[PDB]
Short mmCIF file of C-alpha atoms and ligand atoms in Angstrom, two decimals:
data_model
loop_
_atom_site.label_atom_id
_atom_site.label_comp_id
_atom_site.label_asym_id
_atom_site.label_seq_id
_atom_site.Cartn_x
_atom_site.Cartn_y
_atom_site.Cartn_z
CA UNK A 1 43.86 -38.97 -102.91
CA UNK A 2 42.06 -40.76 -105.53
CA UNK A 3 39.41 -38.96 -106.56
CA UNK A 4 38.15 -37.17 -110.25
CA UNK A 5 38.78 -41.08 -111.62
CA UNK A 6 36.21 -43.13 -112.16
CA UNK A 7 36.65 -46.62 -112.18
CA UNK A 8 34.67 -47.68 -115.01
CA UNK A 9 36.47 -45.31 -117.22
CA UNK A 10 39.60 -43.66 -116.33
CA UNK A 11 40.57 -46.78 -114.10
CA UNK A 12 40.58 -48.56 -117.65
CA UNK A 13 41.51 -45.76 -119.67
CA UNK A 14 37.98 -45.46 -121.42
CA UNK A 15 36.51 -42.43 -122.36
CA UNK A 16 32.74 -40.96 -121.87
CA UNK A 17 30.56 -40.21 -125.05
CA UNK A 18 31.13 -35.91 -124.53
CA UNK A 19 34.16 -35.84 -121.96
CA UNK A 20 35.80 -34.83 -124.76
CA UNK A 21 33.80 -31.85 -125.62
CA UNK A 22 35.10 -30.02 -121.62
CA UNK A 23 38.29 -31.18 -122.92
CA UNK A 24 38.45 -28.82 -126.83
CA UNK A 25 36.64 -26.45 -124.55
CA UNK A 26 39.75 -25.29 -122.70
CA UNK A 27 41.21 -23.60 -125.65
CA UNK B 1 18.20 -31.10 -116.81
CA UNK B 2 16.19 -29.38 -118.94
CA UNK B 3 17.46 -31.09 -122.94
CA UNK B 4 20.30 -33.47 -121.16
CA UNK B 5 20.81 -37.00 -122.04
CA UNK B 6 20.75 -40.35 -120.21
CA UNK B 7 24.30 -40.41 -118.55
CA UNK B 8 26.08 -43.46 -118.64
CA UNK B 9 26.51 -46.73 -116.08
CA UNK B 10 29.29 -45.68 -113.81
CA UNK B 11 29.80 -41.94 -114.92
CA UNK B 12 29.10 -40.25 -111.79
CA UNK B 13 30.42 -42.67 -108.76
CA UNK B 14 29.99 -39.61 -107.03
CA UNK B 15 26.44 -37.84 -107.79
CA UNK B 16 24.31 -38.65 -104.28
CA UNK B 17 20.10 -38.42 -103.83
CA UNK B 18 19.42 -36.47 -101.22
CA UNK B 19 16.26 -38.64 -99.87
CA UNK B 20 13.06 -37.47 -98.13
CA UNK B 21 12.32 -40.59 -95.50
CA UNK B 22 8.94 -40.02 -95.74
CA UNK B 23 6.94 -38.85 -97.98
CA UNK B 24 9.71 -40.78 -99.89
CA UNK B 25 10.29 -38.26 -102.72
CA UNK B 26 13.91 -37.26 -104.29
CA UNK B 27 15.34 -33.54 -102.19
CA UNK B 28 18.16 -33.09 -104.48
CA UNK B 29 20.82 -33.60 -105.40
CA UNK B 30 24.47 -33.82 -103.96
CA UNK B 31 28.17 -35.31 -104.44
CA UNK B 32 30.74 -37.78 -102.41
CA UNK B 33 33.91 -35.68 -101.98
CA UNK B 34 34.94 -38.50 -98.62
CA UNK B 35 34.46 -41.72 -97.86
CA UNK B 36 32.20 -40.23 -95.45
CA UNK B 37 30.98 -36.72 -96.31
CA UNK B 38 29.12 -35.04 -99.10
CA UNK B 39 29.12 -31.85 -100.38
CA UNK B 40 25.16 -29.99 -101.29
CA UNK B 41 23.70 -26.49 -102.18
CA UNK B 42 22.82 -25.07 -98.89
CA UNK B 43 18.69 -24.42 -99.95
CA UNK B 44 18.26 -27.80 -99.89
CA UNK B 45 18.50 -27.71 -96.12
CA UNK B 46 17.19 -24.43 -94.94
CA UNK B 47 14.88 -22.50 -97.13
CA UNK B 48 12.35 -20.16 -94.23
CA UNK B 49 10.48 -18.45 -97.44
CA UNK B 50 9.40 -22.20 -98.61
CA UNK B 51 9.42 -23.31 -94.29
CA UNK B 52 11.84 -25.99 -95.89
CA UNK B 53 14.65 -26.45 -92.71
CA UNK B 54 14.73 -30.15 -92.20
CA UNK B 55 16.74 -31.79 -89.64
CA UNK B 56 19.01 -34.76 -89.99
CA UNK B 57 17.16 -37.25 -89.06
CA UNK B 58 14.88 -36.50 -91.76
CA UNK B 59 16.51 -37.69 -94.50
CA UNK B 60 18.89 -40.11 -96.49
CA UNK B 61 21.94 -40.31 -99.12
CA UNK B 62 21.62 -42.42 -101.66
CA UNK B 63 24.56 -43.11 -103.59
CA UNK B 64 25.35 -45.44 -106.58
CA UNK B 65 22.20 -44.91 -108.65
CA UNK B 66 21.50 -43.80 -112.02
CA UNK B 67 17.18 -44.89 -111.66
CA UNK B 68 15.67 -41.59 -110.32
CA UNK B 69 12.55 -44.24 -108.51
CA UNK B 70 14.01 -48.35 -108.93
CA UNK B 71 15.71 -49.90 -105.81
CA UNK B 72 18.50 -50.60 -107.62
CA UNK B 73 19.25 -53.48 -105.57
CA UNK B 74 22.72 -54.84 -105.06
CA UNK B 75 25.30 -51.50 -106.50
CA UNK B 76 23.29 -48.44 -104.87
CA UNK B 77 24.22 -47.72 -101.02
CA UNK B 78 21.82 -45.46 -98.75
CA UNK B 79 23.30 -44.80 -95.78
CA UNK B 80 22.03 -42.77 -92.93
CA UNK B 81 23.44 -38.40 -91.69
CA UNK B 82 24.84 -37.88 -88.13
CA UNK B 83 24.99 -33.93 -88.55
CA UNK B 84 24.14 -31.26 -91.08
CA UNK B 85 26.79 -28.10 -91.53
CA UNK B 86 24.55 -25.01 -93.11
CA UNK B 87 27.59 -22.40 -94.70
CA UNK B 88 27.24 -19.28 -91.10
CA UNK B 89 27.04 -17.00 -93.48
CA UNK B 90 24.39 -18.28 -96.05
CA UNK B 91 22.35 -15.75 -97.42
CA UNK B 92 18.53 -17.36 -97.65
CA UNK B 93 17.40 -13.98 -96.99
CA UNK B 94 18.60 -12.25 -100.50
CA UNK B 95 20.06 -14.27 -103.11
CA UNK B 96 21.62 -17.24 -101.80
CA UNK B 97 24.87 -16.26 -101.45
CA UNK B 98 26.78 -18.82 -100.14
CA UNK B 99 24.21 -21.63 -100.61
CA UNK B 100 26.63 -24.78 -99.00
CA UNK B 101 26.52 -27.39 -96.84
CA UNK B 102 27.91 -30.76 -95.31
CA UNK B 103 26.12 -33.96 -94.76
CA UNK B 104 28.45 -36.39 -92.34
CA UNK B 105 27.45 -39.82 -92.88
CA UNK B 106 26.63 -42.26 -89.81
CA UNK B 107 29.04 -45.27 -91.23
CA UNK B 108 31.30 -45.07 -94.10
CA UNK B 109 30.24 -46.06 -97.57
CA UNK B 110 32.29 -48.29 -99.30
CA UNK B 111 33.69 -47.61 -103.06
CA UNK B 112 33.03 -49.96 -106.39
CA UNK B 113 32.67 -49.29 -109.61
CA UNK B 114 29.66 -47.07 -108.49
CA UNK B 115 30.90 -45.77 -106.07
CA UNK B 116 33.83 -42.87 -105.74
CA UNK B 117 34.21 -39.77 -104.65
CA UNK B 118 35.23 -36.52 -107.00
CA UNK B 119 38.19 -34.00 -106.16
CA UNK B 120 37.48 -30.25 -105.13
CA UNK B 121 39.67 -27.38 -106.60
CA UNK B 122 42.72 -26.58 -105.39
CA UNK B 123 44.04 -22.19 -106.23
CA UNK B 124 45.82 -23.05 -109.54
CA UNK B 125 43.09 -25.84 -110.76
CA UNK B 126 40.28 -22.97 -110.62
CA UNK B 127 42.68 -20.55 -111.99
CA UNK B 128 43.05 -22.39 -115.54
CA UNK B 129 39.95 -23.42 -114.77
CA UNK B 130 37.43 -20.92 -114.21
CA UNK B 131 37.10 -19.50 -118.04
CA UNK B 132 34.16 -18.53 -119.41
CA UNK B 133 34.06 -20.88 -122.60
CA UNK B 134 35.05 -23.54 -120.95
CA UNK B 135 32.55 -25.66 -121.14
CA UNK B 136 31.65 -28.10 -117.67
CA UNK B 137 29.24 -30.94 -116.65
CA UNK B 138 25.34 -30.65 -115.16
CA UNK B 139 23.70 -34.04 -113.89
CA UNK B 140 21.00 -34.30 -111.71
CA UNK B 141 17.38 -36.24 -111.24
CA UNK B 142 15.48 -33.28 -111.68
CA UNK B 143 12.56 -31.57 -114.33
CA UNK B 144 12.90 -32.68 -118.40
CA UNK B 145 10.97 -29.01 -118.78
CA UNK B 146 10.45 -25.64 -116.96
CA UNK B 147 6.62 -26.84 -115.97
CA UNK B 148 7.33 -35.38 -120.17
CA UNK B 149 7.92 -34.03 -115.77
CA UNK B 150 10.97 -36.77 -114.23
CA UNK B 151 13.31 -38.96 -115.92
CA UNK B 152 14.10 -42.31 -115.42
CA UNK B 153 17.61 -41.66 -115.56
CA UNK B 154 20.22 -40.05 -114.20
CA UNK B 155 20.77 -36.72 -116.80
CA UNK B 156 23.31 -35.49 -117.73
CA UNK B 157 24.17 -31.23 -120.40
CA UNK B 158 27.70 -30.07 -120.44
CA UNK B 159 27.65 -26.64 -119.98
CA UNK B 160 29.44 -23.01 -121.01
CA UNK B 161 30.75 -21.21 -117.51
CA UNK B 162 29.76 -17.49 -118.99
CA UNK B 163 30.86 -13.96 -118.10
CA UNK B 164 30.82 -12.29 -115.63
CA UNK B 165 28.62 -9.03 -117.02
CA UNK B 166 26.64 -11.24 -118.60
CA UNK B 167 25.36 -12.74 -115.99
CA UNK B 168 25.10 -9.93 -113.67
CA UNK B 169 22.71 -8.12 -116.80
CA UNK B 170 20.94 -11.44 -117.10
CA UNK B 171 18.81 -10.95 -113.63
CA UNK B 172 18.21 -8.45 -110.76
CA UNK B 173 19.34 -10.68 -108.40
CA UNK B 174 22.27 -9.12 -106.59
CA UNK B 175 24.87 -11.14 -108.26
CA UNK B 176 28.23 -11.76 -106.21
CA UNK B 177 31.88 -13.42 -106.13
CA UNK B 178 30.10 -16.86 -104.61
CA UNK B 179 29.08 -17.37 -107.51
CA UNK B 180 29.08 -17.58 -111.28
CA UNK B 181 26.47 -18.91 -114.24
CA UNK B 182 26.72 -21.59 -116.47
CA UNK B 183 24.85 -21.42 -120.16
CA UNK B 184 24.19 -21.15 -123.80
CA UNK B 185 23.25 -18.19 -125.88
CA UNK B 186 19.69 -18.30 -127.36
CA UNK B 187 22.14 -17.51 -130.78
CA UNK B 188 24.56 -20.66 -129.48
CA UNK B 189 22.27 -22.76 -130.89
CA UNK B 190 23.33 -25.46 -128.23
CA UNK B 191 20.44 -25.17 -124.76
CA UNK B 192 20.55 -27.62 -121.06
CA UNK B 193 20.18 -26.16 -117.85
CA UNK B 194 19.31 -27.21 -114.21
CA UNK B 195 15.87 -26.89 -113.19
CA UNK B 196 14.48 -27.81 -109.69
CA UNK B 197 15.79 -31.16 -108.49
CA UNK B 198 18.84 -31.03 -109.60
CA UNK B 199 19.88 -28.49 -106.67
CA UNK B 200 22.82 -29.77 -104.85
CA UNK B 201 24.18 -31.25 -107.28
CA UNK B 202 27.94 -30.94 -109.16
CA UNK B 203 29.28 -29.28 -111.31
CA UNK B 204 32.24 -30.87 -112.97
CA UNK B 205 35.66 -30.30 -114.63
CA UNK B 206 38.07 -32.75 -116.14
CA UNK B 207 41.28 -31.46 -115.74
CA UNK B 208 43.46 -31.67 -118.66
CA UNK B 209 46.80 -32.27 -116.46
CA UNK B 210 45.78 -34.83 -114.79
CA UNK B 211 43.12 -36.00 -115.90
CA UNK B 212 41.49 -36.05 -112.53
CA UNK B 213 37.65 -35.31 -112.32
CA UNK B 214 36.97 -31.54 -110.25
CA UNK B 215 33.75 -30.05 -109.04
CA UNK B 216 33.84 -26.54 -109.24
CA UNK B 217 30.16 -25.55 -108.76
CA UNK B 218 27.63 -26.57 -106.89
CA UNK B 219 23.86 -26.57 -108.74
CA UNK B 220 22.35 -23.21 -106.72
CA UNK B 221 19.18 -20.76 -108.18
CA UNK B 222 17.82 -19.85 -111.21
CA UNK B 223 15.18 -17.76 -112.95
CA UNK B 224 12.75 -20.85 -114.89
CA UNK B 225 14.84 -24.38 -116.43
CA UNK B 226 15.92 -23.24 -119.39
CA UNK B 227 15.26 -19.51 -120.72
CA UNK B 228 16.92 -18.11 -123.58
CA UNK B 229 18.97 -14.79 -122.57
CA UNK B 230 19.32 -16.93 -118.76
CA UNK B 231 21.64 -18.47 -117.31
CA UNK B 232 22.07 -21.12 -114.26
CA UNK B 233 24.32 -19.75 -111.15
CA UNK B 234 26.06 -22.12 -109.54
CA UNK B 235 27.45 -21.94 -105.62
CA UNK B 236 31.95 -21.16 -106.13
CA UNK B 237 32.76 -23.42 -105.11
CA UNK B 238 36.81 -23.37 -104.47
CA UNK B 239 36.17 -19.41 -102.88
CA UNK B 240 33.76 -21.07 -100.00
CA UNK B 241 36.95 -24.14 -100.07
CA UNK B 242 38.09 -23.21 -96.77
CA UNK B 243 34.86 -23.74 -95.02
CA UNK B 244 34.38 -26.84 -96.15
CA UNK B 245 38.11 -27.43 -94.93
CA UNK B 246 37.44 -26.25 -91.56
CA UNK B 247 34.41 -28.59 -91.45
CA UNK B 248 35.81 -31.71 -91.86
CA UNK B 249 39.23 -30.52 -89.77
CA UNK B 250 37.25 -29.86 -86.25
CA UNK B 251 35.03 -32.79 -87.20
CA UNK C 1 5.46 -40.91 -105.30
CA UNK C 2 6.48 -43.03 -107.38
CA UNK C 3 9.06 -44.34 -106.11
CA UNK C 4 10.54 -47.83 -105.39
CA UNK C 5 9.75 -49.38 -102.15
CA UNK C 6 13.25 -48.89 -99.92
CA UNK C 7 13.83 -52.08 -97.64
CA UNK C 8 12.83 -51.29 -93.57
CA UNK C 9 16.25 -51.58 -92.10
CA UNK C 10 17.17 -48.05 -93.43
CA UNK C 11 14.71 -46.37 -91.91
C1 LIG D 1 15.04 -23.14 -111.66
C2 LIG D 1 16.31 -23.98 -111.30
N1 LIG D 1 16.86 -23.20 -111.89
C3 LIG D 1 18.17 -23.54 -112.96
N2 LIG D 1 19.35 -23.30 -113.40
C4 LIG D 1 18.85 -24.05 -111.44
C5 LIG D 1 18.40 -24.53 -110.47
C6 LIG D 1 16.75 -24.15 -109.91
C7 LIG D 1 16.36 -24.40 -109.17
N3 LIG D 1 15.59 -24.08 -108.17
C8 LIG D 1 15.91 -24.04 -107.28
C9 LIG D 1 16.69 -22.53 -105.69
N4 LIG D 1 15.75 -21.58 -105.86
C10 LIG D 1 15.05 -20.88 -104.54
CL1 LIG D 1 14.94 -21.84 -102.93
C11 LIG D 1 14.15 -19.74 -104.30
N5 LIG D 1 14.10 -18.91 -105.57
C12 LIG D 1 14.95 -19.01 -106.74
N6 LIG D 1 15.26 -18.21 -108.15
C13 LIG D 1 14.21 -17.19 -108.24
C14 LIG D 1 15.16 -16.28 -108.21
F1 LIG D 1 14.47 -15.38 -108.39
F2 LIG D 1 16.69 -16.33 -108.78
C15 LIG D 1 15.94 -16.13 -106.61
C16 LIG D 1 17.75 -15.98 -106.51
C17 LIG D 1 18.02 -16.04 -105.19
C18 LIG D 1 17.54 -16.04 -103.99
C19 LIG D 1 15.91 -16.01 -104.84
N7 LIG D 1 15.27 -15.59 -105.20
C20 LIG D 1 16.08 -20.83 -107.07
O1 LIG D 1 16.19 -20.83 -107.77
#
């Protein structure tokens, strides 16, 4: 119920070095 | 992982390492779907052709790791297995159809900035994301090339889902619905693929709807590591979603 | 193998 939300990223509203690549692919 | 790159600290708080007690060595990757349940590929625990049939009291689950060899003190957490569950219709005899399995820990693990569970898909999520072209992310502590050897820290690679037709024309093995392949075309330029040692690891996709991460596939099998024309086949988690639920409900 | 030793308590 709180999965998929990483403590060191989603939780602190921070992205990682490439996660954007996935979003840009879901065209 | 072949043609990957070091992961960022805490980039996969759900990654799990299947550790072989004696002799101490990496067995397979895995994923934490609950504070007590870990998902993994079914051929990591059972595979007669190679005389592999690991018993629960033969392994250890190391969760929260970034390093492959070093016992990352004060961070990782090693847990013991209580019961192994393999899909009753797992084809280790032919094409590894339904290559999935669970592992209930003896004591629940405590989350943290390094240990956090991943979300399992629903019919809707799976529907809109599992599409050829849509990239996913694979990570593991496996070989760096088909034949350096192992990596120092967890490897990662974003790969694009490939079309059913293409997958089937890339092999001689019977490709079922319980699986899908992912990878870059020879022309596309980019490479990357899982490899021996990466089995069991999680193939995830971050949902653009609620920004939560989801495990769509489980690293299953392949023919060579990162060969052009060759792709990687991952267990289609959602299609096996019912068996998973049943195994956790009953237990 | 080349793996660091894991504390006994877990074995
Ligand atoms: C080499 C790998 N490459 C990848 N892209 C992803 C994972 C890889 C790890 N291999 C471990 C799992 N595997 C096992 Cl037990 C047996 N035969 C494998 N490959 C050979 C094969 F012809 F494709 C195959 C597929 C299905 C059943 C038997 N043999 C295999 O793959």
